[PDB]
Each structure stands twice: as structure tokens, then as C-alpha cells.
Amino acid sequence: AGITGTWYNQLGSTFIVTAGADGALTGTYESAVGNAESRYVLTGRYDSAPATDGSGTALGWTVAWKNNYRNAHSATTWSGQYVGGAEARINTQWLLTSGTTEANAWKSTLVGHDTFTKVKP
Amino acid sequence: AGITGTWYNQLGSTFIVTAGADGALTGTYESAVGNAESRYVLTGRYDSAPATDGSGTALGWTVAWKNNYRNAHSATTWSGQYVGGAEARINTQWLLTSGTTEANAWKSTLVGHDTFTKVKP
């Protein structure tokens, strides 16, 4: 039990993460949607000493959508919390910002929400 | 890439970041006064091969609000783009998620926007 492991979101993406003792998140992300192919590097942070009152564990991570196969000139950040239990879950909201000209910057950012489970839905 | 260095927002915060050749963002996020109790690890990713058509450079990073002195049980992710030139800027939107119980999860996430400059206010 814990954050370290392989997770899947509701759209079939694969989030392979390690939670280090120092609060570091590392691993790879593979998206089933969008301008993306194969695995991408992710890095992020999580609360390594969460509250003991029943609250979830806050965390966030970033993927820049460049790898050896494609470059979408964009990056997604997921912000959320880990919730333990017999059906562990990470609930997130995300922002996907593209590199744009100034005239197009107003429409540079998509917003959404992803839920991750260790059992693929 | 023009990203490595010290950046300042509109509300008295500062971060020092190194943009690695591979796409890594690493550094420290802190307050204007710069005391140790206000400093936190920052980690993220950026597009290390941006477009050459005048578009910005997509990037994102996370700070979990725990250091050796305090812990807010929360984390912010900034998603945005770097725009170069004599008045360089990092223009972001952010999500700040707190660890909560399930009953309070509906109100776990704040949203906002931050612009960063290289010039100390």
C-alpha cells in the first residue's frame, strides 16, 4: 500500500510512479489520448508526512509532452491527493498548457480531472 | 532556453530553477525575505526543444508545502509557458490541492494564476 506503483486513469493511461522518502515523485506516463505516443518522463512532489486525521496525501506531477517519438510542445500538471483503502485511488485535476504565440495565449490551457486506481477500470 | 535563474511573482514569492538539457526543472521556491522556514523543493519538466515560430516554451512544476520546519499538507502545480526577450516572463495557471477527508474533498482545490519576471520587485 502507498503511492509507489502502477496506476491507470479512467481513459486507459498508465502512470508508473515511485514515491521517494524525500518527497520526490519519479517515473513514466503513457497517455491513451491526445498528441502522445509511448512513455514520457514525469517528476513531481508529494507530502511525505501526511496528517493523521483521515485526510488524503497531497501530491502533484508534471509531464512535458516531448520524447524520442513526438513533441507536442505542451505540458500537463496533475494536482490531487492519494486516498488509501481496499480500493486505493488518486483523485486529480489537471492543466494542459501549450506553447503559443501571444495572440493565441488566451486559449493555451485545457482543464480536466483524472481519477487513478491500481486496478485498471 | 532562458529559463535557468531566479524568478519573482507579483505577491512576494521567488524561485530559483535550473533547466536541465534533458527537460528537467529543479530548484527551490521561497519568499521574498528568504528565510529557511519559507523554502521548499521545486521539481518539474519543460519542453527542451520548443518551436521556433515565436511560440512560448511549455513547462510545469510542483511544490509540496512540506519542509523541515512546517507542513501545510498541500501541493501546488503551476502549468504555463516561458516567453523570452528583454522582458522575459513565465505565465502560469496553478492548482493548489490540500489533503482532505472524502466529505471535504469537493473543496480541496484552489485555482489561480501567477506571472513571473526576472526583475526583483
From Swiss-Prot, chains A, B:
Subcellular locations according to the entry: Secreted
Entry keywords, A to Z: Biotin, Secreted, Signal
GO CC terms of this entry: extracellular region
Residue ranges annotated as motif Cell attachment site: 45-47
Domain Avidin-like: 1-121
Annotated function: The biological function of streptavidin is not known. Forms a strong non-covalent specific complex with biotin (one molecule of biotin per subunit of streptavidin).
Family named by the database record: Belongs to the avidin/streptavidin family.
Protein name per its UniProtKB record: Streptavidin
Organism: Streptomyces avidinii
Parent-record interval covered: 39 to 159 of 183
